[PDB]
Amino acid sequence: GKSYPTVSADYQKAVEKAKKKLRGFIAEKRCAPLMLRLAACSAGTFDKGTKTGGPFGTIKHPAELAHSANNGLDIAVRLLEPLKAEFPILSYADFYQLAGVVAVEVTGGPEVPFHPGREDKPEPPPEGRLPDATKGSDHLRDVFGKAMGLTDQDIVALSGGHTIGAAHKERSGFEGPWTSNPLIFDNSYFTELLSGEKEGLLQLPSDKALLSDPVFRPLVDKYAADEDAFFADYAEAHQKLSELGFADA
Amino acid sequence: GKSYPTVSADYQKAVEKAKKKLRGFIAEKRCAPLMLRLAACSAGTFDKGTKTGGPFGTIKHPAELAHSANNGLDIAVRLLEPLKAEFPILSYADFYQLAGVVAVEVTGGPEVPFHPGREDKPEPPPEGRLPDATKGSDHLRDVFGKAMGLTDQDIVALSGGHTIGAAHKERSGFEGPWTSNPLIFDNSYFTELLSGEKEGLLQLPSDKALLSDPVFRPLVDKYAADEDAFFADYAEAHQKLSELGFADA
Ligand code: HEM
Ligand code: HEM
Numbered sequence: 001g002k003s004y005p006t007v008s009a010d011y012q013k014a015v016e017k018a019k020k021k022l023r024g025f026i027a028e029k030r031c032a033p034l035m036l037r038l039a040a041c042s043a044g045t046f047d048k049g050t051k052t053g054g055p056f057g058t059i060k061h062p063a064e065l066a067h068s069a070n071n072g073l074d075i076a077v078r079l080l081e082p083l084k085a086e087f088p089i090l091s092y093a094d095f096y097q098l099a100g101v102v103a104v105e106v107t108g109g110p111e112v113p114f115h116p117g118r119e120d121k122p123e124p125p126p127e128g129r130l131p132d133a134t135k136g137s138d139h140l141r142d143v144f145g146k147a148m149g150l151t152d153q154d155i156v157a158l159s160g161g162h163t164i165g166a167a168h169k170e171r172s173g174f175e176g177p178w179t180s181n182p183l184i185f186d187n188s189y190f191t192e193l194l195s196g197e198k199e200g201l202l203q204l205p206s207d208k209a210l211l212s213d214p215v216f217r218p219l220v221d222k223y224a225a226d227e228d229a230f231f232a233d234y235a236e237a238h239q240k241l242s243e244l245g246f247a248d249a
Numbered sequence: 250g251k252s253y254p255t256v257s258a259d260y261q262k263a264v265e266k267a268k269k270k271l272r273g274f275i276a277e278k279r280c281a282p283l284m285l286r287l288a289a290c291s292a293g294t295f296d297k298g299t300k301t302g303g304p305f306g307t308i309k310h311p312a313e314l315a316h317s318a319n320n321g322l323d324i325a326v327r328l329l330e331p332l333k334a335e336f337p338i339l340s341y342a343d344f345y346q347l348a349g350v351v352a353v354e355v356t357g358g359p360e361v362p363f364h365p366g367r368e369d370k371p372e373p374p375p376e377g378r379l380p381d382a383t384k385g386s387d388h389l390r391d392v393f394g395k396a397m398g399l400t401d402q403d404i405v406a407l408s409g410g411h412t413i414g415a416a417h418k419e420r421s422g423f424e425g426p427w428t429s430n431p432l433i434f435d436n437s438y439f440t441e442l443l444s445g446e447k448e449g450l451l452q453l454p455s456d457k458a459l460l461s462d463p464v465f466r467p468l469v470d471k472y473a474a475d476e477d478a479f480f481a482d483y484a485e486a487h488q489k490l491s492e493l494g495f496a497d498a
């Protein structure tokens with residue numbers, strides 16, 4: 001259902017150059033998980049009914065950075081600003097989604113397709129649309145399904161984004177990595193979720209919700225057994241998330 | 250641009266009976282200004298672009314009552330609940346707008362036309378759509394015009410709703426009546442606004458903004474000189490406000 005806009009050759013050349021610069025920067029700075037979180041938090045505010053929010057550059061605004069679910073994302077924005085300044089032709093919206101795609105690639109994940117053309121919008125969405133880590137399956141469906149318009153498959157695959165990174169007690173309050181290799185994009189999130197709590201590792205109530213739901217659980221099992229299947233479904237879901245409200249809602 | 254819904258004869262009979270009961274109750278309780286504020290605060294959250302918010306009964310929800318601009322409105326809702334219970338067939342949305350229309354009538358104001366059929370909606374709008382008393386004309390146009398879809402004339406006439414009632418230092422922080430006769434609906438709001446600050450009386454910065462704007466000021470002058478003209482424009486504006494998002498946005 002997507003009809004992608006035309007951008008100039010110069011715009012396309014900037015996308016390609018920025019992609020390379022983002023690879024080197026993100027790898028050197030060890031900030032792939034923070035950048036994936038920035039991209040997801042940016043996109044996840046989309047509401048299909050009103051066609052408001054979504055990946056349109058608003059996360060750089062102090063008002064959106066101040067949302068409790070976005071604690072620490074001011075660091076991500078600050079980290080990217082010098083590189084963004086080398087690409088004035090690119091929208092912030094495109095730049096942040098490109099950073100998210102690169103974060104997945106540089107950690108060894110799938111190559112998520114990227115299409116340019118998002119425009120920077122003036123007004124941030126209201127606070128409270130991002131998912132609550134303390135809630136369960138009904139809540140996940142309210143946020144990813146009723147608001148964003150994504151599928152149950154997308155919910156499980158995207159939850160696998162937690163295969164990289166960690167929570168911080170000073171940000172959310174939760175603490176620690178989901179996996180033993182938090183800079184490696186693999187299916188270990190699902191294998192750890194299945195094996196139960198392990199010292200040093202994290203499971204949010206929202207992660208655990210996937211285990212007890214009749215639709216989510218078979219997907220968790222599938223992804224734990226088959227990393228290729230996880231990668232395929234992940235790439236599909238990340239692309240959709242990154243394009244919410246864009247080139248047709 | 251309105252196409253009003255059909256309601257049953259029993260619904261119409263309840264509207265008429267509730268109107269009478271609201272007259273007696275509001276007059277006896279001396280709460281007309283509080284009820285006019287309840288109706289206006291309910292309706293003023295409408296956003297024409299997204300077709301969200303508006304006079305759809307959500308003001309009774311704890312979450313909307315908790316909005317800072319709605320301080321004290323929990324009292325208004327509590328006051329009306331026993332009477333509302335005598336009319337189970339009526340929507341809360343209709344009931345609160347009817348209370349606002351009656352508040353104006355019983356204090357001697359114009360007879361604002363009323364059409365039933367608003368449905369009670371499940372979700373309150375986000376906080377922050379109601380006007381800020383410390384701001385000026387640009388802000389008033391953003392809220393009443395860009396969001397609600399009302400005219401400059403409507404802004405000045407509706408500001409005259411302050412001809413009844415008072416601010417409270419424990420609610421907004423502002424304090425006192427706009428007029429010497431705060432239970433009498435007349436054009437004195439405009440005459441006091443023009444005459445400058447008077448001890449015992451209140452002018453918000455948002456009221457004062459009407460004085461210096463090239464479009465608003467001639468209307469203030471007109472209403473101060475001609476109460477009949479004020480009543481006509483007020484009735485038109487109140488009707489529009491009470492029907493935002495209803496029977497065609
Ligand atoms: C499914 C609902 C989700 C919930 C409830 C949730 C919640 C959280 C929480 C509480 C944190 C910890 C923040 C901190 O304390 O630093 C976090 C981190 C993170 N999230 Fe999610 N999230 C969800 C979905 C997603 C999605 C869809 C993605 C991307 C596909 C994602 C990517 C990440 C990453 C990469 C981190 C680590 C950040 C870092 O290492 O600094 N999350 N998430
Ligand atoms: C134009 C932008 C407006 C602003 C900035 C504004 C602001 C305020 C504030 C700060 C208060 C004091 C609340 C308190 O401390 O108790 C108040 C009270 C009140 N407002 Fe407005 N208001 C506006 C428009 C309206 C409109 C359109 C109406 C109805 C037509 C209205 C009707 C009232 C009434 C009747 C009161 C008195 C409530 C009482 O006596 O308890 N206002 N308003």
Ligand SMILES: [K+]
Nearest residue numbers: 163179181184
């Ligand atoms: K991992």
Ligand SMILES: [K+]
Nearest residue numbers: 412428430433
């Ligand atoms: K008066």
